[PDB]
Target: Dynamin-like 120 kDa protein, mitochondrial
Amino acid sequence: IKRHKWNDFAEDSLRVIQHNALEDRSISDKQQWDAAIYFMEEALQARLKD
Amino acid sequence: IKRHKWNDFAEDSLRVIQHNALEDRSISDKQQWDAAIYFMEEALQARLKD
Amino acid sequence: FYYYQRHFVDSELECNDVVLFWRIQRMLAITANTLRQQLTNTEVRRLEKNV
Model:
Protein backbone atom coordinates (compact mmCIF):
# COMPACT_ATOMS: atom_id res chain seq x y z
CA ILE A 1 0.00 0.00 0.00
CA LYS A 2 2.84 2.40 0.83
CA ARG A 3 4.53 1.72 -2.52
CA HIS A 4 1.26 2.13 -4.45
CA LYS A 5 1.23 5.03 -6.92
CA TRP A 6 -1.71 5.82 -9.19
CA ASN A 7 -1.19 7.04 -12.75
CA ASP A 8 -0.61 10.80 -12.85
CA PHE A 9 -2.01 11.19 -16.38
CA ALA A 10 -5.36 9.65 -15.42
CA GLU A 11 -6.41 12.78 -13.52
CA ASP A 12 -5.76 15.08 -16.48
CA SER A 13 -7.46 12.72 -18.95
CA LEU A 14 -10.54 12.24 -16.76
CA ARG A 15 -10.94 15.99 -16.22
CA VAL A 16 -11.75 16.48 -19.91
CA ILE A 17 -13.79 13.25 -20.03
CA GLN A 18 -16.31 14.27 -17.38
CA HIS A 19 -16.27 17.90 -18.56
CA ASN A 20 -17.64 16.89 -21.97
CA ALA A 21 -20.01 14.35 -20.37
CA LEU A 22 -21.60 17.00 -18.14
CA GLU A 23 -21.80 19.57 -20.96
CA ASP A 24 -24.83 17.84 -22.50
CA ARG A 25 -28.23 19.38 -21.75
CA SER A 26 -30.66 17.10 -23.63
CA ILE A 27 -32.49 14.08 -22.21
CA SER A 28 -33.66 11.95 -25.14
CA ASP A 29 -34.86 9.02 -22.99
CA LYS A 30 -38.14 9.01 -21.06
CA GLN A 31 -36.79 6.42 -18.62
CA GLN A 32 -33.72 8.57 -17.93
CA TRP A 33 -36.01 11.41 -16.85
CA ASP A 34 -37.88 9.04 -14.53
CA ALA A 35 -34.60 7.65 -13.18
CA ALA A 36 -33.37 11.17 -12.38
CA ILE A 37 -36.62 11.87 -10.51
CA TYR A 38 -36.17 8.72 -8.42
CA PHE A 39 -32.51 9.53 -7.78
CA MET A 40 -33.44 13.06 -6.69
CA GLU A 41 -36.15 11.71 -4.38
CA GLU A 42 -33.72 9.37 -2.61
CA ALA A 43 -31.14 12.13 -2.14
CA LEU A 44 -33.78 14.62 -0.97
CA GLN A 45 -35.26 12.10 1.48
CA ALA A 46 -31.86 11.46 3.08
CA ARG A 47 -31.26 15.19 3.55
CA LEU A 48 -34.83 15.66 4.77
CA LYS A 49 -34.40 12.91 7.37
CA ASP A 50 -31.27 14.60 8.71
CA ILE B 1 -16.13 27.80 -46.70
CA LYS B 2 -12.57 28.48 -47.88
CA ARG B 3 -11.77 30.37 -44.66
CA HIS B 4 -13.30 27.65 -42.47
CA LYS B 5 -10.84 25.92 -40.14
CA TRP B 6 -11.84 23.23 -37.65
CA ASN B 7 -10.25 23.02 -34.21
CA ASP B 8 -6.95 21.14 -34.32
CA PHE B 9 -7.19 19.95 -30.70
CA ALA B 10 -10.56 18.25 -31.30
CA GLU B 11 -8.93 15.40 -33.23
CA ASP B 12 -6.47 14.60 -30.43
CA SER B 13 -9.15 14.85 -27.73
CA LEU B 14 -11.62 12.66 -29.61
CA ARG B 15 -8.98 9.97 -30.27
CA VAL B 16 -8.78 9.20 -26.55
CA ILE B 17 -12.55 9.62 -26.11
CA GLN B 18 -13.55 6.90 -28.58
CA HIS B 19 -10.58 4.72 -27.56
CA ASN B 20 -11.92 4.43 -24.01
CA ALA B 21 -15.50 4.09 -25.28
CA LEU B 22 -14.62 1.10 -27.47
CA GLU B 23 -12.48 -0.53 -24.76
CA ASP B 24 -15.57 -1.75 -22.88
CA ARG B 25 -16.53 -5.40 -23.40
CA SER B 26 -19.65 -5.80 -21.21
CA ILE B 27 -23.27 -5.41 -22.34
CA SER B 28 -25.40 -4.87 -19.24
CA ASP B 29 -28.62 -4.07 -21.14
CA LYS B 30 -30.82 -6.71 -22.77
CA GLN B 31 -32.23 -4.14 -25.21
CA GLN B 32 -28.71 -3.12 -26.26
CA TRP B 33 -28.01 -6.72 -27.26
CA ASP B 34 -31.22 -6.80 -29.30
CA ALA B 35 -30.39 -3.43 -30.87
CA ALA B 36 -26.95 -4.70 -31.92
CA ILE B 37 -28.58 -7.75 -33.53
CA TYR B 38 -30.95 -5.53 -35.52
CA PHE B 39 -28.10 -3.20 -36.51
CA MET B 40 -26.02 -6.18 -37.66
CA GLU B 41 -28.96 -7.54 -39.66
CA GLU B 42 -29.43 -4.26 -41.54
CA ALA B 43 -25.72 -3.99 -42.35
CA LEU B 44 -25.52 -7.65 -43.39
CA GLN B 45 -28.61 -7.35 -45.59
CA ALA B 46 -27.15 -4.36 -47.45
CA ARG B 47 -23.91 -6.23 -48.13
CA LEU B 48 -25.86 -9.37 -49.05
CA LYS B 49 -27.97 -7.42 -51.56
CA ASP B 50 -24.82 -6.09 -53.24
CA PHE C 1 -41.32 15.30 -19.76
CA TYR C 2 -43.94 15.74 -22.50
CA TYR C 3 -43.80 19.52 -22.06
CA TYR C 4 -39.99 19.41 -22.15
CA GLN C 5 -40.15 17.30 -25.33
CA ARG C 6 -41.70 20.28 -27.16
CA HIS C 7 -39.22 22.78 -25.66
CA PHE C 8 -41.98 24.59 -23.76
CA VAL C 9 -39.63 27.25 -22.40
CA ASP C 10 -42.54 29.66 -21.92
CA SER C 11 -44.17 27.10 -19.61
CA GLU C 12 -43.47 27.73 -15.93
CA LEU C 13 -42.62 24.04 -15.37
CA GLU C 14 -38.91 24.64 -15.97
CA CYS C 15 -37.53 21.49 -14.35
CA ASN C 16 -33.95 22.77 -14.28
CA ASP C 17 -33.13 20.73 -11.16
CA VAL C 18 -34.22 17.46 -12.79
CA VAL C 19 -32.00 18.12 -15.82
CA LEU C 20 -29.04 19.00 -13.58
CA PHE C 21 -29.45 15.85 -11.47
CA TRP C 22 -29.78 13.76 -14.64
CA ARG C 23 -26.46 15.20 -15.83
CA ILE C 24 -24.86 14.26 -12.50
CA GLN C 25 -26.29 10.73 -12.66
CA ARG C 26 -25.08 10.28 -16.25
CA MET C 27 -21.64 11.60 -15.26
CA LEU C 28 -21.47 9.15 -12.35
CA ALA C 29 -22.29 6.20 -14.62
CA ILE C 30 -19.54 7.19 -17.07
CA THR C 31 -17.07 7.80 -14.24
CA ALA C 32 -17.85 4.44 -12.62
CA ASN C 33 -17.36 2.57 -15.91
CA THR C 34 -14.15 4.46 -16.71
CA LEU C 35 -12.70 3.82 -13.25
CA ARG C 36 -13.68 0.14 -13.45
CA GLN C 37 -11.83 -0.25 -16.75
CA GLN C 38 -8.78 1.58 -15.40
CA LEU C 39 -8.78 -0.56 -12.24
CA THR C 40 -9.11 -3.78 -14.25
CA ASN C 41 -6.30 -2.89 -16.69
CA THR C 42 -4.11 0.07 -15.72
CA GLU C 43 -3.32 -0.64 -12.07
CA VAL C 44 -3.17 -4.46 -12.13
CA ARG C 45 0.30 -4.41 -13.70
CA ARG C 46 1.57 -1.88 -11.15
CA LEU C 47 0.18 -4.00 -8.31
CA GLU C 48 1.99 -7.06 -9.68
CA LYS C 49 5.23 -5.10 -10.06
CA ASN C 50 5.12 -3.83 -6.47
CA VAL C 51 4.37 -7.32 -5.13
Remarks:
- The two ends of chain A are 36 Å apart (CA to CA).
- Chain A has two helices and no strands.
